[PDB]
Amino acid sequence: MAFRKSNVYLSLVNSYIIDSPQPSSINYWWNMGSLLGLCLVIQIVTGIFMAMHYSSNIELAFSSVEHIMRDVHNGYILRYLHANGASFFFMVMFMHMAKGLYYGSYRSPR
Amino acid sequence: AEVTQLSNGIVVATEHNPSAHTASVGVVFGSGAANENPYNNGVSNLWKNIFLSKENSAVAAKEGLALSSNISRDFQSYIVSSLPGSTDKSLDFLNQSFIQQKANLLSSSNFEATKKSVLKQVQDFEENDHPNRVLEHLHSTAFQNTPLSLPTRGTLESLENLVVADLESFANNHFLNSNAVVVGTGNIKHEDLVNSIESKNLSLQTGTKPVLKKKAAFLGSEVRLRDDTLPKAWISLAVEGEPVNSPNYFVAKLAAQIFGSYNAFEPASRLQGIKLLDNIQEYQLCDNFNHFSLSYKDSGLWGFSTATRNVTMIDDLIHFTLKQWNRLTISVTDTEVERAKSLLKLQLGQLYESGNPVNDANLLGAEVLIKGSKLSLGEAFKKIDAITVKDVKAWAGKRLWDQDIAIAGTGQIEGLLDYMRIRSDMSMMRW
Amino acid sequence: KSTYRTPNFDDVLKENNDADKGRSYAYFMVGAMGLLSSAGAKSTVETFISSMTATADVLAMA
Amino acid sequence: TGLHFGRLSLRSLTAYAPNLMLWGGASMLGLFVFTEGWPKFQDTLYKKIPL
Amino acid sequence: SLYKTFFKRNAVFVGTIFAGAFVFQTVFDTAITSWYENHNKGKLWKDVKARIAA
Amino acid sequence: VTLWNVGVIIFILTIATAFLGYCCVYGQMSHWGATVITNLFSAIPFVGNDIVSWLWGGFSVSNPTIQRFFALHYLVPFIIAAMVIMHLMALHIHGSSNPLGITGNLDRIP
Amino acid sequence: PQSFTSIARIGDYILKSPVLSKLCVPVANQFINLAGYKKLGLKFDDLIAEENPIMQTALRRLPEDESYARAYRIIRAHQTELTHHLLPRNEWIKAQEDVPYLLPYILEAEAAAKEKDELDNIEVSK
Amino acid sequence: PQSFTSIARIGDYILKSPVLSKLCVPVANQFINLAGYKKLGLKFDDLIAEENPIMQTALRRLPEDESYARAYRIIRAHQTELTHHLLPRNEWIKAQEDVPYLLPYILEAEAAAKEKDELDNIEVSK
Ligand SMILES: CCCCCCCCCCC(=O)OC[C@H](COP(=O)(O)OC[C@H](O)COP(=O)(O)OC[C@@H](COC(=O)CC)OC(=O)CCC)OC(=O)CCCCCCCC
Ligand SMILES: CCCCCCCCCCCCCCCCCC(=O)OC[C@H](COP(=O)(O)OCCN)OC(=O)CCCCCCCCCCCCC
Ligand code: HEM
Ligand code: HEM
Ligand SMILES: COc1c(O)c(C)c(C/C=C(/C)CC/C=C(\C)CC/C=C(\C)CC/C=C(\C)CC/C=C(\C)CCC=C(C)C)c(O)c1OC
Numbered sequence A: 001m002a003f004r005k006s007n008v009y010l011s012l013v014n015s016y017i018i019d020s021p022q023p024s025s026i027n028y029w030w031n032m033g034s035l036l037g038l039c040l041v042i043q044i045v046t047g048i049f050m051a052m053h054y055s056s057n058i059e060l061a062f063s064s065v066e067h068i069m070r071d072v073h074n075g076y077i078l079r080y081l082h083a084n085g086a087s088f089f090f091m092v093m094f095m096h097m098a099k100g101l102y103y104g105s106y107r108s109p110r
Numbered sequence B: 001a002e003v004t005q006l007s008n009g010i011v012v013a014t015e016h017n018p019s020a021h022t023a024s025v026g027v028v029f030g031s032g033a034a035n036e037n038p039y040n041n042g043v044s045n046l047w048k049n050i051f052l053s054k055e056n057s058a059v060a061a062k063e064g065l066a067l068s069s070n071i072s073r074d075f076q077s078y079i080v081s082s083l084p085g086s087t088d089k090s091l092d093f094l095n096q097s098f099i100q101q102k103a104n105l106l107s108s109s110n111f112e113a114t115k116k117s118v119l120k121q122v123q124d125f126e127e128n129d130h131p132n133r134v135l136e137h138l139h140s141t142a143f144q145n146t147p148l149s150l151p152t153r154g155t156l157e158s159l160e161n162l163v164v165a166d167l168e169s170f171a172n173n174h175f176l177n178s179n180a181v182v183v184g185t186g187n188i189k190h191e192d193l194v195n196s197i198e199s200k201n202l203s204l205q206t207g208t209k210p211v212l213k214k215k216a217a218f219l220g221s222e223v224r225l226r227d228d229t230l231p232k233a234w235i236s237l238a239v240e241g242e243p244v245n246s247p248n249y250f251v252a253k254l255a256a257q258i259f260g261s262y263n264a265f266e267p268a269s270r271l272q273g274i275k276l277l278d279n280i281q282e283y284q285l286c287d288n289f290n291h292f293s294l295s296y297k298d299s300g301l302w303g304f305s306t307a308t309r310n311v312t313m314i315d316d317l318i319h320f321t322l323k324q325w326n327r328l329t330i331s332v333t334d335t336e337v338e339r340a341k342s343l344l345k346l347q348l349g350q351l352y353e354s355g356n357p358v359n360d361a362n363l364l365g366a367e368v369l370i371k372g373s374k375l376s377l378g379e380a381f382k383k384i385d386a387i388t389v390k391d392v393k394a395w396a397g398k399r400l401w402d403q404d405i406a407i408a409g410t411g412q413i414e415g416l417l418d419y420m421r422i423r424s425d426m427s428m429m430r431w
Numbered sequence C: 001k002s003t004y005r006t007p008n009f010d011d012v013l014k015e016n017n018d019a020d021k022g023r024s025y026a027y028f029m030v031g032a033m034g035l036l037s038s039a040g041a042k043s044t045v046e047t048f049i050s051s052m053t054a055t056a057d058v059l060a061m062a
Numbered sequence D: 001t002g003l004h005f006g007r008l009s010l011r012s013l014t015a016y017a018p019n020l021m022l023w024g025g026a027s028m029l030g031l032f033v034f035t036e037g038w039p040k041f042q043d044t045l046y047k048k049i050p051l
Numbered sequence E: 001s002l003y004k005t006f007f008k009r010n011a012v013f014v015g016t017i018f019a020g021a022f023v024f025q026t027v028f029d030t031a032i033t034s035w036y037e038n039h040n041k042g043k044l045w046k047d048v049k050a051r052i053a054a
Numbered sequence F: 001v002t003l004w005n006v007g008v009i010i011f012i013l014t015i016a017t018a019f020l021g022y023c024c025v026y027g028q029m030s031h032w033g034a035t036v037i038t039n040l041f042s043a044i045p046f047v048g049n050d051i052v053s054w055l056w057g058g059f060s061v062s063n064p065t066i067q068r069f070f071a072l073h074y075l076v077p078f079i080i081a082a083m084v085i086m087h088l089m090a091l092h093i094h095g096s097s098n099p100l101g102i103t104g105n106l107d108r109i110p
Numbered sequence G, H: 001p002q003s004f005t006s007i008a009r010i011g012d013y014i015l016k017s018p019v020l021s022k023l024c025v026p027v028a029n030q031f032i033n034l035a036g037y038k039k040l041g042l043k044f045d046d047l048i049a050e051e052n053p054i055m056q057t058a059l060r061r062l063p064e065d066e067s068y069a070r071a072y073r074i075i076r077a078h079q080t081e082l083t084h085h086l087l088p089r090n091e092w093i094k095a096q097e098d099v100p101y102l103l104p105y106i107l108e109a110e111a112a113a114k115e116k117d118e119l120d121n122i123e124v125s126k
């Protein structure tokens, strides 16, 4: 057999994102769950890079976020992509849940 | 052997063999299933069985004569066989069946019983013979809306609407002296045949058959006939190949011999020097396969057919087979090219030097009708021995690499994936 | 009706196939989409990597 | 008569030789792209007159 | 023909994609900075610095 | 062999984790240990003096250095936890060995 | 992963030599008695690792009378070790019985796999 | 998950009533035409969910001439929605053909499962 089917680690990737059987008639409302996986990767990555410059003491916290926005190179891109990214994360989830509520995805066997 | 052609108004070809104990005489016409339309599809198959009907064959068996016939896409044949010292009677019988008196054969009683016999052959073919009907459906989707798509036996829907007048119209337009070759094989001298024809003043019909509007055109396509009650999956797959009178005729034939034919239950067929067999035998993906290179007047096909019971590993069989085809463009060894030279010569020697004069009469007439003469077997061996590794790579990069495909299948083919997952395997691009 | 009669596809078929006419216009778009995505996936990487360099108030005290 | 290899042959090392430094060098045809935006090696960034 | 060398391999084409993206960034940036500064000319600092040089 | 190779990756990530946390104390050994280790990457030809100023965030072990070492130090323990999952998956397909070094499929207990 | 064809190539040169077979054979007899597999009730060919195709082929072709006796020796050995004991001195394998029952089946599986590779990557005389 | 025994219990009370069957039957005929499953080439019994044992039992017992025709209607429907079109007006299901071909097989699978539960948890008369 192919190597992507016999290897312990690639077999999981093949079964999930390559050879997984899908219904032919699903529409673009079935694309919101992949976006929510990109949102989580955006939010986690941008947070690690801001956490290197942050201070959590109550007398230093507010002025540390301004230090990110003024002194850090490309720091205003990191923050605004983070603050607006969370509003986009919640809007795609309300659409994901309302989808399953319309097409009956909550019923048995799911 | 040595052939000899003439033209005294009638084209006469002959291939004498002094070692044979029989002699065959017949006539081959240059029209077949590809010279029909969908309304009269099967009219050439009825002329075969009218010639082989019981009251006609009884007249032959009283003088020691046996009859045969064969229908293909580009030609048709009507042969008479006899002992070597009785070939004068063979020509007289052929005279009162085509040149004269083909109305006693098309009586009402003889046409209804013959029709009922042909409707039962084509029905049992479509329900029991799965390898051959999947290869017919391949021609029907690859060449759709062109003459080369029609089946040679006909269909059950077009056969029922054929009357006697359809048989007579087809004969006036195609059974012509301009479209005919008289052949002779076995123990018969070339000059004894032509003088026998000159002593009778024969003439079938004069000439100028129809024009045939459209040419053959290959289209990438698929047709699936799923049946979950049958116990196997039968699949065929091909690309566009070489016609006859092509320069790459023998290079395409040699590239099919590199992958060859397989039977899982024969022990010696598991030991062939074919690299594809190291992948298939680990999990036993198939029962048999065979690679073909078919050639017609206008186009051709190159590919393979398979049958299997592993209905869950179909995608691995199609994948591994198409990755070997890629090697013909990238990496093909000199050893693989010398093996295929030797076995191809053995394959062509058995076809052309069999014992049957009836098979040799069909090969001779089809070749003379389509290029004017017949190539010797000693000249064909020299062409095969002059093929290099560079010639195979140039042919494959034109005909195989990143090219469209035709597919047909029947049986348990749920595991056969979509067109574009298979189309993508025709180019490596890990490269 | 018979399975050997194929249905009509004349409303979707290109008059002249030209084997390299669908092979030139299809692959030019798949190449352009990979060229822009390899440049966009790089400006992204070097934007995050450059945040870890010295800040404006550290270079001033150099 | 035989051929030199440990289950990958110089058959497809010297046929793969035009490829395995071109397809193998297809990853610093990637270094044209992979390695700017920084003052690391500006000797070899802006040297082309398009650049 | 064109397809047998433009993109036949993808060592032909992942190297042409990558090499062509490096040249794209430079040519693309210079064209945007020239349009941006000319659309807002007279308001930038270099124009103000050239009007007080008395 | 694949189980042994994922283990060597765990060992590398655990040396890294322990080093970064010893620097979060900022004692006298914590400051001068980061000095002599980060200055070893200055010997790499043609990129040595640029990766050291990028690790430090400046021109010496200083405040950007300690704030980024703490944020990386919380992260890497969660990468180790994912290497451990991959490590167990490679053990389940063949199982464990035994001190005799022969097959164990003849005598098994749960 | 040294082949058995190579081990016997070296060994048969030592044994058929007069001067070499008197310095290395006494050394090799003390090496086997200090190892201690005979005290667990094992022959040497039981210790060979079997997670490879050449050893899976040799074990399929082993006769069943000898295959049933091998499985009992291996089960008895796993149980003598879970208890941290040795077997009685009259149940030890003796030197007469410590024979290579599996070596001949291995050497013919190796000579056939090598013959196949030499043919799969041959170049032609022409 | 309302049982079909209960649906027909209510429905047959409405239909055999003179005054009730003239206010709710016209309402129910407009409800079916506005739903639009007949325009995709579907009958109502194709829409019933089948991921439960009472519906798996009814489908095994369905004759095969009717089972082969059901699978074609379902495949044709997935393809018609994939293209965002409707079928031609002469391929729509008509009201004569919209018959409950699967209802009788369902009601006998339900009456047998209820009979079994009443016997599995019965108490004795003594
Ligand atoms: C921030 C993230 C952005 C993305 C979020 C939204 C994406 C999911 C929305 C679902 C959707 O696609 O809207 C369709 C919806 C219901 O209709 P349906 O499901 O039956 O048909 C789907 C068919 O596959 C279309 O796609 P179609 O098959 O018709 O053609 C392909 C289409 C590609 O367009 C897109 O990229 C759509 C994302 O071709 C073009 O448009 C070419 C451009 C000229 O009818 C509507 O139009 C409603 C619009 C959405 C309003 C609700 C949200 C407001 C808060
Ligand atoms: C606790 C959590 C509660 C969560 C509730 C959150 C509510 C806010 C969520 C906003 C998104 C809601 C949109 C509805 C999505 C469900 C799926 C859906 O409605 O699509 C099917 C519907 C039918 O039309 P089709 O032609 O596509 O037919 C296909 C099947 N019949 O196709 C359609 O999409 C209908 C056409 C588009 C309607 C757009 C109207 C505005 C929707 C609200 C958006 C937000 C406020 C403006
Ligand atoms: C699901 C993932 C996350 C969500 C939904 C989320 C949400 C938020 C929100 C809404 C804010 C306030 C934004 C503002 O108005 O400024 C914030 C701030 C912050 N978050 Fe995140 N966050 C996520 C992940 C992370 C992670 C993993 C980290 C650390 C590694 C992080 C670090 C920070 C920091 C340092 C701030 C303060 C700086 C700022 O205000 O932007 N975040 N987060
Ligand atoms: C967080 C670190 C680790 C964890 C949690 C872990 C966990 C485990 C567990 C539960 C087993 C099975 C039981 C056992 O054999 O004791 C195992 C086996 C094994 N581990 Fe680890 N391991 C770790 C690190 C390592 C490292 C650093 C190596 C080598 C460099 C390694 C190599 C192996 C091997 C070879 C085995 C199989 C031994 C056998 O079956 O005989 N592991 N590990
Ligand atoms: C229905 O068909 C589908 C389907 O369509 C899809 C898309 C998926 C896959 C869907 C997903 C949503 C994927 C899942 C994604 C996650 C669970 C995200 C989790 C991982 C992350 C968020 C990445 C975390 C990142 C890090 C640990 C590193 C970040 C920090 C860095 C790089 C700094 C490093 C330090 C220095 C100094 C450089 C399916 O599984 C599936 O089912 C078959």
Ligand SMILES: CCCCCCCCCCCCCCCCCC(=O)O[C@H](COC(=O)CCCCCC)COP(=O)(O)OCCN
Residues within 6 Å of the ligand: A007, A009, A010, A012, A013, F001, F002, F005, F006, F079, F082
């Ligand atoms: C972003 C946070 C990371 C969390 C996700 C973890 C992914 C890290 C990958 C680690 C690679 C481990 C390699 C060590 C073993 C090498 C020996 C070997 O032969 O094994 C390797 C295992 O390789 C992988 O694990 C990568 C698969 C993707 C995993 C998706 C779940 C053999 O498999 P593979 O084919 O992938 O590697 C050769 C490539 N041709």
